[PDB]
Amino acid sequence: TRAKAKTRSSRAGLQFPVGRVHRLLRKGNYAERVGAGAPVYLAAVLEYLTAEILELAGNAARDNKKTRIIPRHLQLAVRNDEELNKLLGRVTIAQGGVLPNIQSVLLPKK
Amino acid sequence: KRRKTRKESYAIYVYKVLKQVHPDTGISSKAMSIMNSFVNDVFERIAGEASRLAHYNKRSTITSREIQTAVRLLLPGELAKHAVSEGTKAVTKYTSAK
């Protein structure tokens, strides 16, 4: 008989779908062949990036006394982190707003 | 009674990661769409960088090291090194398992 089916994500200890990433790589016109470890590695990298952004967005939501992530929290998380801001520098987040930043010269002379 | 077509998305995996990093925290539909678009964009960036890396070296296979070099090229510093560490750990665990 055949062995019980185990997902490649479970073997890799990842939450992102290794099989779906592998299928997308094969059918994405990227290369003639795709190695076995490439989908695992890419799923791990995507999961880590998602974890970073989601953790920062959850911190922002908790700061805003909210228990649900909205686009504003994602924008705050991305723009408050230097490396994430550099990674998504040319990316616009819908309904994200802008960070509070008023130049000092415009402030009243108190 | 026409069932809508199957549209694949990373929503369930993003939800699992969110529950891992923040158990008592939710995510709206717009935020989920934004996260899905972010995952798709990063996937496209890394895959294209790996494809041009393979083409430059006259190779026909995208391997783990091509993806690693793409991550090192595209990510800003500490993000890159932590992503490389996570990827190598996942690949090592997968190879060790089967």
Binding site: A51, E55 | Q20, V21, H82
Partner: peptide, 8 residues
């Protein structure tokens, strides 16, 4: 349940 070493 999950923490990242980047934020210490």
């Amino acid at each position: 349940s999950r923490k990242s070493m980047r934020q210490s």
